[PDB]
Amino acid sequence: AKPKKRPKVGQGFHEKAQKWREEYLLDRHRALADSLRAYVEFSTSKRVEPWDARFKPFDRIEKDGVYVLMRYMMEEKLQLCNYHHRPVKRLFCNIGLMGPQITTKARWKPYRFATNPAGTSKAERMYQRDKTVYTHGHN
Amino acid sequence: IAKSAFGFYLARRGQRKYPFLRRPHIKNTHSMNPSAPYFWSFMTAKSQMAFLPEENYITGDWTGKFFVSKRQVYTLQHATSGAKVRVKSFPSIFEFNSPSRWNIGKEMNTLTKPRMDLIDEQMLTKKQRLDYVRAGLLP
Amino acid sequence: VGYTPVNPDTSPMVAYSQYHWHYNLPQGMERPHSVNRTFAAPFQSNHSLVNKYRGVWIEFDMHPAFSVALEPQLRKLPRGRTLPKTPAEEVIADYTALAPLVDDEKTRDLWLAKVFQHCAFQRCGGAMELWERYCHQRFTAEGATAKPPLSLVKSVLFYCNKTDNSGWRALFDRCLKDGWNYTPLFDTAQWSFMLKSIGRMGDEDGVRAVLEEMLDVQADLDRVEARSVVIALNAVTNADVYEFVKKYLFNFGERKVKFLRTTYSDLRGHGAGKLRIPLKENDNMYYHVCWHSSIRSPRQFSPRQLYFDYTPSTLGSSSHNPNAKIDDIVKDKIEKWKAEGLLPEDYVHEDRVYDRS
Amino acid sequence: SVSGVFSKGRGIGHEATTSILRYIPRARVPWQPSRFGRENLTAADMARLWSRGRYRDGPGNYNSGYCTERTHVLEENTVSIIPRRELEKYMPDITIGPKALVTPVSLMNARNGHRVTHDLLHSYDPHIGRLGKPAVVDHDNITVEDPNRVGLNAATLDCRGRIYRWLRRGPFFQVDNYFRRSVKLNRDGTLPTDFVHEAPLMRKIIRLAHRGHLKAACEEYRRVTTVPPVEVYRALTACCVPGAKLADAVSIFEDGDSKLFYVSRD
Amino acid sequence: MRHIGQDVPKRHTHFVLESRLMYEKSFRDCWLHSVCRAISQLDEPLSKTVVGTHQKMLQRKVTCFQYNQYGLFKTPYYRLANVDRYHAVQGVAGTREWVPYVNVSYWTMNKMVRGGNLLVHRVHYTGWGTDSHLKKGGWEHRWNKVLQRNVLQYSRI
RNA sequence: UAUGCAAAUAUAAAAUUAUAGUAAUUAUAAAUUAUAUUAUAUUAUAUUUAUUCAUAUAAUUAAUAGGAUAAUAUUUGUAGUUUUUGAUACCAUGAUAAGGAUUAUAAAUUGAAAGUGUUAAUAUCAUAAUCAAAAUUUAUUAUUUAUAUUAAAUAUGUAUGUGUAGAUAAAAUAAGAA
Numbered sequence A: 001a002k003p004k005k006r007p008k009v010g011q012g013f014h015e016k017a018q019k020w021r022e023e024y025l026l027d028r029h030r031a032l033a034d035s036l037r038a039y040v041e042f043s044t045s046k047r048v049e050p051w052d053a054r055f056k057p058f059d060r061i062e063k064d065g066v067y068v069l070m071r072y073m074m075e076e077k078l079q080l081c082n083y084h085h086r087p088v089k090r091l092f093c094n095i096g097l098m099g100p101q102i103t104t105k106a107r108w109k110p111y112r113f114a115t116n117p118a119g120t121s122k123a124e125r126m127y128q129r130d131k132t133v134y135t136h137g138h139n
Numbered sequence B: 001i002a003k004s005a006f007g008f009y010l011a012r013r014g015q016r017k018y019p020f021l022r023r024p025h026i027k028n029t030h031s032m033n034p035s036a037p038y039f040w041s042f043m044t045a046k047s048q049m050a051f052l053p054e055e056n057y058i059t060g061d062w063t064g065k066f067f068v069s070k071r072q073v074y075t076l077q078h079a080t081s082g083a084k085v086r087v088k089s090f091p092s093i094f095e096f097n098s099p100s101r102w103n104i105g106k107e108m109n110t111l112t113k114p115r116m117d118l119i120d121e122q123m124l125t126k127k128q129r130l131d132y133v134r135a136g137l138l139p
Numbered sequence C: 001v002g003y004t005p006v007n008p009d010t011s012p013m014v015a016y017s018q019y020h021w022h023y024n025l026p027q028g029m030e031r032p033h034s035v036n037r038t039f040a041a042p043f044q045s046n047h048s049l050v051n052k053y054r055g056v057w058i059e060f061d062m063h064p065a066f067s068v069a070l071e072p073q074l075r076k077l078p079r080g081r082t083l084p085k086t087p088a089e090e091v092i093a094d095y096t097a098l099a100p101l102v103d104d105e106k107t108r109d110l111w112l113a114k115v116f117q118h119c120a121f122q123r124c125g126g127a128m129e130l131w132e133r134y135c136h137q138r139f140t141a142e143g144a145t146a147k148p149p150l151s152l153v154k155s156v157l158f159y160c161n162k163t164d165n166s167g168w169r170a171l172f173d174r175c176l177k178d179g180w181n182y183t184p185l186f187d188t189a190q191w192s193f194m195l196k197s198i199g200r201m202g203d204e205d206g207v208r209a210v211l212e213e214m215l216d217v218q219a220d221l222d223r224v225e226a227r228s229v230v231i232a233l234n235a236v237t238n239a240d241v242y243e244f245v246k247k248y249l250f251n252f253g254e255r256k257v258k259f260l261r262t263t264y265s266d267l268r269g270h271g272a273g274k275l276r277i278p279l280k281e282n283d284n285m286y287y288h289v290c291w292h293s294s295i296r297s298p299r300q301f302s303p304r305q306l307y308f309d310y311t312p313s314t315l316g317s318s319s320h321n322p323n324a325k326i327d328d329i330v331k332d333k334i335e336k337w338k339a340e341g342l343l344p345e346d347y348v349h350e351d352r353v354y355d356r357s
Numbered sequence D: 001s002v003s004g005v006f007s008k009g010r011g012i013g014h015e016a017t018t019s020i021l022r023y024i025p026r027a028r029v030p031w032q033p034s035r036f037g038r039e040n041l042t043a044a045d046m047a048r049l050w051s052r053g054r055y056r057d058g059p060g061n062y063n064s065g066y067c068t069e070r071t072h073v074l075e076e077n078t079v080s081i082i083p084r085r086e087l088e089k090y091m092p093d094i095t096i097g098p099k100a101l102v103t104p105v106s107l108m109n110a111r112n113g114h115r116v117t118h119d120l121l122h123s124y125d126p127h128i129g130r131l132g133k134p135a136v137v138d139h140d141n142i143t144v145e146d147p148n149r150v151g152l153n154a155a156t157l158d159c160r161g162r163i164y165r166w167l168r169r170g171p172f173f174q175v176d177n178y179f180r181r182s183v184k185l186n187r188d189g190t191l192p193t194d195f196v197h198e199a200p201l202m203r204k205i206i207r208l209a210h211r212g213h214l215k216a217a218c219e220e221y222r223r224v225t226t227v228p229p230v231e232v233y234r235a236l237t238a239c240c241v242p243g244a245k246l247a248d249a250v251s252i253f254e255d256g257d258s259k260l261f262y263v264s265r266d
Numbered sequence E: 001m002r003h004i005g006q007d008v009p010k011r012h013t014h015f016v017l018e019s020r021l022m023y024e025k026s027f028r029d030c031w032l033h034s035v036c037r038a039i040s041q042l043d044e045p046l047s048k049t050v051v052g053t054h055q056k057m058l059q060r061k062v063t064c065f066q067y068n069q070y071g072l073f074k075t076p077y078y079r080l081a082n083v084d085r086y087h088a089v090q091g092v093a094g095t096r097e098w099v100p101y102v103n104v105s106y107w108t109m110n111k112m113v114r115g116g117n118l119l120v121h122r123v124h125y126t127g128w129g130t131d132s133h134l135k136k137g138g139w140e141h142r143w144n145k146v147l148q149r150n151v152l153q154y155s156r157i
Numbered sequence F: 001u002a003u004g005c006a007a008a009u010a011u012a013a014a015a016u017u018a019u020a021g022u023a024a025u026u027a028u029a030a031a032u033u034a035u036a037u038u039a040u041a042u043u044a045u046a047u048u049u050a051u052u053c054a055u056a057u058a059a060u061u062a063a064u065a066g067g068a069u070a071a072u073a074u075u076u077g078u079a080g081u082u083u084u085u086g087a088u089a090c091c092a093u094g095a096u097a098a099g100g101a102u103u104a105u106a107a108a109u110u111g112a113a114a115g116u117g118u119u120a121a122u123a124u125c126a127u128a129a130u131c132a133a134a135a136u137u138u139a140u141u142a143u144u145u146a147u148a149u150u151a152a153a154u155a156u157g158u159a160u161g162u163g164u165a166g167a168u169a170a171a172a173u174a175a176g177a178a
């Protein structure tokens, strides 16, 4: 019986929490601008070839096989699409002359392996990406 | 230990498993999760054509609201008018004293951090401070 | 067990106990019940009949030829549930200018009844001159022998009640059984209008005469509206007619007297604006109506209010009373013995104990 | 050592009946002789109790827009109410008024007997919003403050019985109450017609009927709220003769006589 | 009030009445709110009569009316808490602490079945009961069969 | 560790204790109570799999009142303030759970009664209750591992590091184990 009021939050905590929230919002603004810049630059920059050079369709020498078709028919548009996996797969679908061979028989490098830059030559590159950028794993 | 009236009335019953997306008390601790590519599709209305929620407008002959609703989406007038904007949050409230144009079109709950990283060193007890130090949250 | 009760219809344990029918035993009807056939209640509705006419009907029925001939004139007179808003003097002038032309006593009487009804609806008090011009010479004067039509007499009564005229008695006395004997054909609406008009006019003997005639002729007191009865019973002040009202109030039903009390209370209180003319203060009649309603209604039990001041016997509560008189019992016994004669008559008795107060 | 929730109350009947009625004992309930209901509360206490009925969006709640306090203490931290003028700067003002809350009679059936969007369920029977005065529901004066205690809330005093009565409503309860309390027959015996607001609709129906547009005539007849006069029914019936629409004529006659005070008994 | 002469053993039992009232408010507002929501966010033209500005202006006006509707029942059913009517114990639908047919909590159900207060039949705890649909496909199959019995059985006009 | 110094239970007795005065009898017995399979014999046990586990919020519970096609009620619109005091922010009797070790094949089920927050007598400032958009520090909880990855109620930005210490979880039932 006879309830009494009991403080729960610190006496000076409220204003400190307010200013911490304001500073966090400003830091989030800065990080958002940085992440937008990095995402746009990643999307525009050319990436590595997303096809495995160790499987049946992409095994021939660069002077034969599907590589001749790629170099003489759809070479121009690969630079415009910047070798991203989704546009290259869509272009391979639309070009024909391959049929279901891009899915029933072909294979592609994983999602985090196909996002490496044009020249990497190293496995640990995917872990060298900036961490303060909140681009959700898009360099 | 959260202190509320419902804490005594109800029981946590351990780490019980709830139906998908049907927890009783919603606590969107992930509202402030940053994602630059998904900036317009995270914790926001799915369609760009949708109007702003009712909570962004005044309906009746009001006399005044102490704080605006969290779902109220920040607009240009919020910063341009230079008025007073407050959002209810732990512990008491968060006031927008730093009007910025980078948060136009985003919900105030998305802008405000629910789970504040700051920890009060005042109300913490001896055992609780020892626990926080052991966890590493406190020196 | 617990504060919350157990419903036996839903609880299977009660339904399958030895005091009810188990599910293994055959399920069949036992002792068929006929309640609506052995004693069927009459239909009494809490809400009044919505489709009721709620007015006095004049039973307008004339020859079709005369009706169609007077159709241009009769459009202004009220029809069945249709009331034109023509000025009353216009129809009065039309009647006084065209009645001698049409040669039919019954048609003239019906037309005059419609004129009276219209002027009563408009509350125009100037139409009594029409009655004195046409009907007074032959229907009621120095022992008039004529038999007026029921429609005409009912219309005249409605008009006089609406205008609160003082000439209604000369016609009602003729309408008693020894004269025209039109009392049994009066509608309950007519009776209610008469009672309300007399209550407003404050006639002490009129209310008594009307109530006695209604009881004699078996008018439906229950269907007579409560407000008219309340207004009629508010105006009685003389002791004799008040006693008559007291003894007559037992004729009404229990629900009727309860709602009479309710209407009287609300009208002399909050519903004072409901009446166009405010009701006079008659606290004697108000108190008697409330008391009679309390008598007629079933009596509940309120033990705390009934026995708030109850005190036990002196001998019964002597142990629990620190200062109580016990020699009073001995004094009562001595008085009883003296009355019986065993003790000497009127013997001097001295106090047996000290007076502690 | 006497404590009381309310320190003052008022009676129901004024000083014209109680002074005479006090001499007649009243059989009060044996286990609670003294009763104190919402209709017995003082003005300020009743207002402050009715404000707290609504969970939110009500005057009782500290932050609902209709509060009147200058400041509110929150977790041992004072806060100042943002006034309506300052809110208006960044909150666009949309306000129609009492007309927005109310809905038409034709939509009352679809809304399940409710013509008001107010968060307190308004019942047209004179027993649920039973203050000292009988419960009368207004239409163009509906407001959040609601000065007349005609709505139903589930937090005020002596509300459990009213809630039970509301839940035990029969079919067509509100519709029947609205009909019987709005379209009552006149005392003088005249049908409840000649309504000034409803008059143009009758003329439109008559024009369509005499123009032979019976389908549109009925489609506008269904919009009639009060009881139409005998002219509408006679025109509608006379429209069926050229088309030999005996079915529709009989339906019109039934709808006229069986239900609406025998208007079509002509 | 204020626990002076309380009649019900539990104060929280009144929340059951409050929940019934909120369900009745939902019954009132479920058509108007749905119609306003459907009209507001329909990008395609409604018909030949209303197109372009005559449609967009109407959508704005109906959205304004919906916002001005004070007390509209916005909240969905699944977010309304379920409280037992016998002992005022809260249970959340979808878990095991609430039964759908009796609308009482797990504790109340256990008490009523252990006593005699609800005619139920016992089945094996680790089986599919005795229902053919439950044996066939389970909860989802019986749910779909309820849908089929209700709506899909009828060849709608 | 017997050479000297040393009578000593093998019993002629009179309720306990006590110097043969102190207290009021004193002792003793039987039954029962959780510690000890034995090595053919009422059963071969011995294999597979797994382990970074977290969430609760903005106060008023103590009445009945009937409407169309019914032989008539304005009961349209029913109006009497104030003497009581507990399941509420302690306490305010009882009651359901989890926990496999010996009654077995056979026309057969591998889940227990010894008690788990809410429930029926002790009172004596108690307005703590969801109707959305919310605040991890709390024992009792199986998460998706590297070809293609965010569209409708808003729904998780974090921890790549030799299948990797300690400690620990599960299964002999349409499955495959002697």
Ligand SMILES: O=c1ccn([C@@H]2O[C@H](COP(=O)(O)OP(=O)(O)OP(=O)(O)O)[C@@H](O)[C@H]2O)c(=O)[nH]1
Pocket (backbone or CB within 6 Å): C196, C225, C227, C274, C275, C276, C277, D187, F074
């Ligand atoms: O039973 C009732 C109820 C109510 N009223 C209401 O009384 C109002 C007039 O008030 P009065 O009823 O006092 O006037 P009156 O004697 O002239 O009335 P009638 O006999 O001519 O009807 C009328 O407008 C009516 O609504 C009654 O007349 N009777």
